[PDB]
Amino acid sequence: MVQSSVLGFPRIGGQRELKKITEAYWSGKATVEELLAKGKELREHNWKLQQKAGVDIIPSNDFSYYDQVLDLSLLFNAIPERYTKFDLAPIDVLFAMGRGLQAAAAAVDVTALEMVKWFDSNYHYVRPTFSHSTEFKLNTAAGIKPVDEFNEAKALGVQTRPVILGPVSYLYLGKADKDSLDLEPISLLPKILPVYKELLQKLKEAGAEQVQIDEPVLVLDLPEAVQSKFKEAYDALVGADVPELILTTYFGDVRPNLKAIENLPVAGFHFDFVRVPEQLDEVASILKDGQTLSAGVVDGRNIWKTDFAKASAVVQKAIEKVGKDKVVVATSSSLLHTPVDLESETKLDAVIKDWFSFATQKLDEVVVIAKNVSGEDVSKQLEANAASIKARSESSITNDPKVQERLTTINEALATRKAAFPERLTEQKAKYNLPLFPTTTIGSFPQTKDIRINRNKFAKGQITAEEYEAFINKEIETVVRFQEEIGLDVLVHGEPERNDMVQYFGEQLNGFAFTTNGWVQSYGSRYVRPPIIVGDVSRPKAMTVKESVYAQSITSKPMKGMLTGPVTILRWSFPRDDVSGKIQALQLGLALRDEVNDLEGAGITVIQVDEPAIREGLPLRAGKERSDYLNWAAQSFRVATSGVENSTQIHSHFCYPNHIKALDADVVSIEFEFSEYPNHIGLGKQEFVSRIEEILKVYPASKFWVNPDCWPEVKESLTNMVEAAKEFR
User: Fold this and answer.
1) Which residues have CB under 8 Å from 194's CB, separation 6+?
2) 468-489: burial string, b at 16+ Cβ within 10 Å, e else
3) CATH number at residue 556
4) Of 60, 289, 458, 540, which has fewest CB within 10 angstroms of its CB?
5) What domain range includes position 283?
6) Of the candidates 473, 500, 530, which is a domain's last residue?
7) Which residues are paired to 247 by β-bridges?
8) Is 438 helix (H, G, I), strand (E, B) or coil?
9) Was 576 annotated as part of a binding site?
10) Is 504 annotated as a binding residue?
11) Is 215 labeled as ligand-binding?
12) Last residue of a domain, one of 504, 530, 556
């Protein structure tokens, strides 16, 4: 009776097949034919998996060799002229856009299109780019992806629902190209509607009866002039000659945009009741006679096992309002942002595994929930599920009384430096006596061939800690000696002991679990395997002190300790879903406070704390949630960094402003306003010298450090920088 639905399935493969075959193709090791054979195999496997689980509404076109938004750009001929001058087949035009193109001499080095954050997910899309000259149209000669894949699935005996990003969202998330600065993308709506129409017309003839059309911009703050465009677009698209359209939203709250969609001729809507279950009543209220409501109640972005009782109760609210006949049980968003299969995990204890569901398992969840609300007896599954949920919430690996107690101690003084910056500056001039325009590295340096080899061997115990530790210290002695020669003032250690910004800390923190196979696509063939926060976080012992202490001992110049901030660790992990993001951040703040304190205590008194994920976690609409976030994000950072003496310098580096103000960092390295920065900033060979003079027309030279942008040309690059910083001294 009540149907289940999946908005998208991760395409990388249980064994990361997609990464393997696409990188083989790019490196000339595989043929386009072999590339295509593997894609087909991947799609077929994932379709049969969903059919076998019992899912009624199974997506097609959710597959991609790189990015789904990029696929549409290829499909609609939104292809900048520069990619078309190389005799590349359509699929290679596609990759040229996704990952750039290099060609021998002229001597072309064509940059890939811009990579962008997909809302507040940890996915990145390829920016649709337009010009006044853009001629929107379909290219049947390149094959029509959505039509071909729908047909592929049909031939397998699997009816699917094609998925495509809608016209308003597509344009609105695009940008004007270099030669059309004045162009506002949404203004192209009249040119692209006909092409969507033709595409839908072609999908109907193929025999597609419904199409999932994604309009996620509805969860953003939309200007009134953009809100009006939904009525326009959909009046144009809907008709007898096209599939029924399910207008689909996720990751947030559509209520502010409600009037924009309350009179559309579409056949249904999908809403995210995982992120905003509280919008249910109002969105249900505008549903027309003969519009269906797809209730997103299985998290598409996190790995926790769904509470079947609670998720069924949400769906039952929709039914009570609109009728069992008009409600569908759905994943909150595409499962793109979830790992493929929990069953691939070899190391997780069975107790903890019992708390998770990855994409494969979420298939079974939407099915059980749908059966449950239809009245089918699934008492067995509901009981097992209830047992699992009860078991998690009663665990201890989750609740650490010492951490709880410490949270109660958080207050203003705990999040505040012992003195305001002006007083701190004086104690720091007295201790460090750095010259004007001090120079400093911002991050790590190129990795040695042997670093990788020796690490793998130390992991197999093939070498002793002392052998490995001596290998690291050599890598450090190298990096340290280099910098001294270039004549930098404040050094880094090169971080050779580190593999990544977040797992390096997570592994050394309580409250974390890690997967062996929990891969999620981040961008193109680049995947991430995020740590899972499973409980109260604390930090048993020093995490980075030993290497920093060693690096500092071989030089008389100040050595920077190097850390990742609480919010970035939280944002780049799978978070707990039983406690607030804020509480996890503050626990991380306290754990990092001990680390900062241990560094200082060991004589490392210049400490850089980086928070690259601030903007990525910014709540999607202005308002209370956003302003709280900014407050607690900054508060978390200050809790980690405010235990130090006035003479200890807190640095923080950003890759390119309200949040930054509230951090009270002694030095903010910025990638290049100048307003709410009352302390010191850092900046990243001719116009390099001319740039400092230009900047020294507005702000005093007393305020400026100098630093890298963000491999063996690092000798000259740094040398040139340094030599130029002295030309001002």
Assistant:
1) 136
2) bbebbbebbbebbebbeebebb
3) 3.20.20.210
4) 289
5) 1-394+516-530
6) 530
7) 213, 269
8) coil
9) no
10) no
11) no
12) 530
